[PDB]
Amino acid sequence: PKAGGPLYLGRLVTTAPVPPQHSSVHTDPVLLDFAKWLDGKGARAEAEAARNAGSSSALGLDLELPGPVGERNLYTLHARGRILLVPATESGLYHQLAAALATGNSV
Amino acid sequence: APAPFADFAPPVRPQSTLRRAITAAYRRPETECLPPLVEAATQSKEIRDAAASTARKLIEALRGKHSGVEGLVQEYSLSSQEGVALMCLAEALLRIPDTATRDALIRDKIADGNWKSHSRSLFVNAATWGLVVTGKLTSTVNDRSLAAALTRLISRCGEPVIRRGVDMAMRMMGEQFVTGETIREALKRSKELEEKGFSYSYDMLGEAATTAADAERYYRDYESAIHAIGKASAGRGIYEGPGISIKLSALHPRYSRAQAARVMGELLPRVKALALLAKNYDIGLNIDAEEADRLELSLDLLEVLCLDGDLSGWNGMGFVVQAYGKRCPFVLDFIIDLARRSGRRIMVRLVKGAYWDAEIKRAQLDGLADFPVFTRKIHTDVSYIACAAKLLAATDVVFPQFATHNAQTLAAIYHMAGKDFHVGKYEFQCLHGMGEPLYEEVVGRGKLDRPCRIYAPVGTHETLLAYLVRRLLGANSSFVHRINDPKVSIDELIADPVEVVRAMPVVGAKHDRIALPAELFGDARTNSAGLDLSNEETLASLTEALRESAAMKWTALPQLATGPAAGETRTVLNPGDHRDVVGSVTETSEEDARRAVRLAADAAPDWAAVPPSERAACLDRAAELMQARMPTLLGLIIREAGKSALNAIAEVREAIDFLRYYAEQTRRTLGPGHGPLGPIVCISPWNFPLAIFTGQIAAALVAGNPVLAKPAEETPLIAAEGVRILREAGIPASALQLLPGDGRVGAALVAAAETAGVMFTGSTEVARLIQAQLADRLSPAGRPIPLIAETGGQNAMIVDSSALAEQVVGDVITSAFDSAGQRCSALRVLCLQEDVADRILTMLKGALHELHIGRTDRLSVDVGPVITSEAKDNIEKHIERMRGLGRKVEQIGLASETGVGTFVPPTIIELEKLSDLQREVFGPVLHVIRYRRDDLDRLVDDVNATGYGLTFGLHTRLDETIAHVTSRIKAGNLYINRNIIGAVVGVQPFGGRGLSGTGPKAGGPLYLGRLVTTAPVPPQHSSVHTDPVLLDFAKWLDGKGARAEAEAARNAGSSSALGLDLELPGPVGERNLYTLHARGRILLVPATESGLYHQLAAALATGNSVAIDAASGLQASLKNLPQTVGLRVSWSKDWAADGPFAGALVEGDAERIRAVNKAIAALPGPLLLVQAASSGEIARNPDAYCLNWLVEEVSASINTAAAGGNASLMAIG
Amino acid sequence: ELMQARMPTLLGLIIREAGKSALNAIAEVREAIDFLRYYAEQTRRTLGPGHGPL
């Protein structure tokens, strides 16, 4: 994560905290389609994890940070890109997909 | 057969001179109200100095002893969101009844990690807690921010912070926001301050009954409280002893002027019964003051009660008057006179007023002349002091009760009242948990030795939070906010409002930052004006005008350019009573319809030659004529179309707004190069028989086209009157021909060779017939005849467990049953989250049974008839099918008087799945579906799956749910936390997608451009955003060597207005947004490679995907597309299998275009907006395909006052 | 606080050891101060018993 930014300290502990202002009201639509697919096949635990990931993802965060006058300093969270998924089990794959899709990524 | 309007709105009683003086002041200009108030509030210099010194002493005492929430935020270093989230968690933990269970859940589960693990968002009331924590009101809740903050604070601080939050919330909700959870607890807690000289008035928190059952519950709560208060009073009497305060709106679900007869018949006896009990215990019973439109009605109840001999011997009846209201001094004159006449010493509570922001919004929405309240806070302060001077001169006949937390106000009155005091002369009043710090500096021999009665709310956490937002507005102009602001000096707080107002350059000027309703749109155009159906003068004048309209010999004739034409003549009957003949229509022969089109064609050059500015002037003159003629137009609409007076007002206002909006849009856009299409056939529906009729015609005319106006066969008379008005305003007869008759006249007009465009509003099935007719046709240039087809809806509202049930029910009743559900925008499918469905459904059914159905020439009628017996038959066949499947069906019982008309009772049908509905049922039939919260996204899919896309409503407080639902729903008009029937021209540009419309939206800025051969650039119509798939396609084109096409693609990317996102000016307390999105999947029918590339560029630049005709043989032209572009591209051999499409682009010669147009018209489902061009046209004209028609307009109207107040107006004082 | 108070001395070292101009040495020390204070504040906003160190 970026130095001098709110995600940095969380990389240096074994369980990351929720950083200040770190949330988004946006839900990735492909995540939502994935959750519905999971519910269709009765993967109830995975569909719940998918919905929870969709909500707790901060993808779409878009903040203006306090700074000097005459400048606008913006901070935004986007998808990383394409995530390599190395699953072992079907449930593991569903959880990995949920995490990656909820954050806007392809896999 | 009762005479029309003979019983329209008779007043409860003949209006006395004193009552008429009240009504005369209702909306009196503020500059006229203030001077007499300044005069009445003037005091001597010695008194003003003494009052300033007393106020300074009180304020110094207040500031010298000035926290609970603040101390918690400080101790745990909470952010504001953490503080709010903590209080929401505490609120939820307090819903666990057993203390040991709550403490165990905190210790073992909440503190130790996932609070989420233990059907209702924790944050439903976060707007209220945000007000507590931050002093600022947000209308909706950022539940994801709160969830993050709660996780963060629990993980950082653990059980200790949760414990402190719970204890704080328990103190605030059980001891501060209320005196007690029950009347017994409140009475026990009142002894301490009673011993110091305070008294109490208890508020059981009942308000705004929605059902008979609610009103009964509030009644029995008041009755039980009176017993408890009277037992505790124990003979102390009405001044030393406690009393009760009631709200009339709690005691009847239809407390309004329109239902005055039911109010006097049903509400009055209930108040009397409560008053008789208060009399027996000799306690005060005060009637709280509510919205401005209930003031004068409440006076009729006060009058009866004070004259009722059964209540004689008791002086405990009390009545609030709101000094922020322009009628206040005249109301006081009336009350003082009533006290003299009755011999009752009426207890008069003078307040400033609690509904200020709502009154501003209401007057703006209703287009009324002025506000019923002042718009500068200082004016209310002067009004209050002036009214106190009037009350203090009448202490022998009334008991003044000065309710205020403002130390300057208090000091002014304390000195005005003078040194002679006895208990019973007057008192002050304050709110529990707010006013005690001030009044502990007032009550008692050691202070000012003046009594104070504490207004004491009593009730549970559920009841308290309901209207706590209103009670806290804590606005920047509020004394209690200012006393705590360090930047506000005592000298500022003790400033004398009377002397400040007196010295202003214009005494009583309106607030500069609040628009009068007529000025909502500023320089752009004049807002239409409505009528105040709570104003007795307006009702009396309207009654006469309505009666006079029923004596007019209304006719509708084929008005050809050559004069009226003969034809088959029949009567037009009132749908609510077929014995009431409204007028006569002569219908147009198909021969004369064709002749009219030929005359329109011959006249087209002369009308196109009238400059756009002068055409727009005709529209503006027509709007002025319609505004002046509104009362007469109302009567015709009421009797011809089954509309209530309120809905007829809206109808005429909408027509006026269309005229003025299209006039202004013309003045912004149209020039010599925007040539008219030619004769336009305007075919309109019956249900908005003036507004939509006028809108289509006005748009076509002002764009320079002569019009053939074919109104619905059910409602020709108001159409004929609209045409008469337009002709009077200067539209030549050759430019506007009226052709009454049925669908045959419409079809003959559509089929006529010189018809250059069709504007249709009506059913989807009829539009499909018109689409088929036009598929045979090409313009003389060999291009498709433009069709605007605005069609039906299957409109849903989604309600989650965070919504306020009473708000939902009101919006549902209005959206589903207003006009008997005969609005295209009407709510058809209500979707209730499972956890709240039963409670909301019970409330909705209770509200349904309070509706009055009947002939609409009575103000008391809520729901009128359906338009015809065939419509009734069609609706009832649907109801019976549903009932025959076992679905639960709730219907209001109809009065026998409905037998002379065609009525369908408002009906609620509980469905199992949304697929139970086939087509739009255009009647008063609400379907109800239940959904589990996790299935919200699937539900949105189901709503979209109908293929309609007109109006859609969402009731939620939760930003995550708003973002999700609004991003996934596909409808043209979205409404958040309000009804779904809003179509304010230029504010909610109206029109849908799919089976609901082709667009462009009526009342929006793309509309006129469809009625000319070369579309202008609408005002504000641009976007800085470039579709990234378009950009990838442009790069691909360059890599393929298609250099000119790549340049055209880049140009299309820039020219596209996809991503436009505007807020449209409108009323306070609402945000009205207008956005341009992709339409969906566009069918591309290319002929050449270059044409395909241009078609693709146009479609991608506007955000669409495409289905390309596989029969074009152009597959080899799209080899090696970037994956981003390939994702948007499909190839279609069977177009009907790969739809629905959202538009089409066609390349070919004239006969190819004709053949393709026929094939497109044959596709199932939505009408497609087709644009065609030849290969040469594509080469010559960069705008061969116009990007205006490849985007989809979406209007979203958000009620930002839904949380209980207006944040933006908190800064306006 | 110590780096702020000792900024002039730190500047001299940075200028001579790292080839920095005075203005960029000031920026260097300011950034170090800001990291210290920012991570301190972020810690005060976030870290609790369950966020164990690596």
Ligand SMILES: Cc1cc2nc3c(=O)[nH]c(=O)nc-3n(C[C@H](O)[C@H](O)[C@H](O)COP(=O)(O)OP(=O)(O)OC[C@H]3O[C@@H](n4cnc5c(N)ncnc54)[C@H](O)[C@@H]3O)c2cc1C
């Ligand atoms: C015991 C008690 C009983 C009450 N009963 C009722 C009741 O039955 N009905 C009712 O409507 N209210 C009632 N109120 C009053 C209402 O709830 C507010 O408490 C009251 O208006 C606040 O005025 P204040 O003088 O204490 O303070 P202030 O800060 O002096 O006055 C604030 C008031 O100024 C007015 N105001 C604010 N901005 C503007 C503006 N831009 N233009 C014009 N006016 C403005 C509003 O009325 C606002 O409430 C009652 C109040 C008390 C204390």
Ligand SMILES: NC(=O)c1ccc[n+]([C@@H]2O[C@H](COP(=O)([O-])OP(=O)(O)OC[C@H]3O[C@@H](n4cnc5c(N)ncnc54)[C@H](O)[C@@H]3O)[C@@H](O)[C@H]2O)c1
């Ligand atoms: N999307 C909107 O803005 C909007 C607004 C109001 C009403 N509507 C829809 O209008 C419908 C109700 O109005 P209605 O009952 O008057 O509609 P309709 O389809 O019955 O009739 C509409 C008009 O088309 C004419 N007509 C009928 N058959 C025709 C034909 N074969 N060729 C040419 N013209 C023909 C009628 O005479 C009438 O003037 C509802 O479905 C409603 O949802 C849509």
Ligand SMILES: OCc1ccc2c(c1)CCO2
């Ligand atoms: O908050 C004080 C208050 C008391 C009674 C009342 C209102 C406010 C509004 C209508 O009735």
Ligand SMILES: [Mg+2]
């Ligand atoms: Mg019809």
